[PDB]
């Protein structure tokens, strides 16, 4: 026979200005990528399962640009079947491709290229101007192959997606070490889900678009 019952009505009453949870996501259209599903290649993978990792990898690693029949890389994905190479090695083969060079690097400036490599190789955007410089020096000593290799072999790439996991957008959610500017810069690099990193409009890739960010003073507190 309980009867006292504190009313508890006030706690239930809605806030002055209310947002659905995931309102922040639906604005900014990061809804799809915010928490982002990981795809993992598993042992004794089926024929459909592999097809899905490939599908994923070409969407992330390549830009969200369109891979036509001709574009696809037969030899690399044959090795991915029959487990000759892991997905981490599959990604490395994709990144060193006429196709990856043709888009991305050959038309871009090294600032736009390095900023693109961050993102496709690791969801984050570049945290600081140093990171850009570190990679630009690496490229000048040792060329495009060593440049690419440095992202895939980076400790950060390995810890989040060692091997067997296709890279996903880790940006847009807080990552240890992140540094602020993460969230802001990732919104510039990532348009909507319809947007892509294409050059087809006018041959050149656009200019870096994270150079001015990356070098902004802190606003007078």
């Amino acid at each position: 026979e309980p009867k006292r019952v504190a009313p508890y009505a006030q706690y239930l009453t809605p806030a002055v200005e209310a947002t659905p949870d995931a309102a922040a996501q639906t604005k900014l259209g990061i809804t799809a990528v915010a928490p982002d599903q990981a795809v993992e290649l598993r042992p004794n993978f089926g024929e459909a399962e592999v097809q899905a990792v490939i599908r994923a990898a070409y969407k992330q690693i390549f830009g969200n640009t369109y891979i036509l029949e001709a574009d696809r890389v037969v030899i690399a994905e044959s090795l991915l079947r029959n487990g000759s190479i892991s997905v981490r090695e599959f990604v490395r083969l994709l990144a060193k491709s006429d196709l990856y060079r043709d888009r991305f690097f050959r038309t871009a400036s090294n600032n736009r290229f390095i900023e693109l490599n961050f993102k496709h190789f690791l969801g984050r955007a570049p945290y600081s101007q140093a990171e850009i410089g570190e990679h630009f020096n690496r490229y000048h000593k040792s060329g495009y192959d060593a440049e690419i290799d440095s992202y895939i072999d980076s400790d950060e790439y390995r810890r989040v997606f060692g091997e067997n996991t296709v890279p996903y957008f880790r940006g847009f959610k807080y990552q240890v070490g992140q540094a602020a500017r993460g969230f802001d810069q990732m919104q510039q690099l990532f348009a909507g889900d319809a947007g892509s990193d294409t050059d087809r409009g006018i041959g050149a890739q656009p200019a870096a678009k994270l150079t001015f960010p990356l070098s902004r003073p802190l606003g007078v507190t």
């Binding site: 639906t26 909507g192 889900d193």
Partner: protein
């Protein structure tokens, strides 16, 4: 993502309340139509290839320039992209139709699309046109199937329309 049910929930949540009896009855009714709803979707998916094929033919008969050198659908590579796009739009529309909600369509498919189109130089108006051409053909099937129990699908048909139109508008 979102859909008809989930949506109603969320609304209810902001009020802070259990679902209104009235509101349940929306969902209750919605369920009842399911079967119709499903068949509608099934019709699109079944005819997909053709819907597109068709729309395209008509699109290019009208807007000859797209396929002329200097136009946006020339050369092959470009043409191919345009076909892919049409399919994607369609695909989404269908998804929405099942969900019973525009959202999915708006977020994944339409979001960013205008800007892309702009950057490419693709003529948004023509895109929109295509979407409509598709619409009409699609409805055609939804509305005239074979071996289905005869009854009224109008309600669904109209909602379908709307989805197509949201697309047309946001692209345009």
């Amino acid at each position: 993502m979102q859909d008809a049910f989930t949506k109603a929930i969320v609304a209810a949540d902001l009020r802070g309340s259990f679902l209104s009896e009235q509101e349940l009855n929306q969902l209750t009714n919605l369920v009842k139509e399911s079967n119709k709803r499903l068949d509608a979707v099934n019709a699109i998916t079944g005819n997909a290839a053709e819907i597109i094929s068709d729309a395209a033919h008509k699109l290019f008969a009208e807007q000859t320039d797209l396929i002329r050198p200097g136009g946006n659908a020339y050369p092959n590579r470009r043409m191919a992209a345009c076909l892919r796009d049409m399919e994607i739009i369609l695909r989404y529309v269908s998804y929405a139709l099942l969900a019973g909600d525009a959202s999915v369509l708006e977020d994944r498919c339409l979001n960013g699309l205008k800007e892309t189109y702009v950057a490419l130089g693709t003529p948004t108006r023509s895109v929109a046109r295509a979407v409509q051409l598709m619409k009409e053909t699609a409805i055609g099937y939804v509305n005239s199937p074979s071996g289905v129990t005869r009854g009224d699908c109008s309600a669904l048909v109209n909602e379908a329309a709307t989805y197509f139109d949201k697309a047309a508008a946001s692209i345009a």
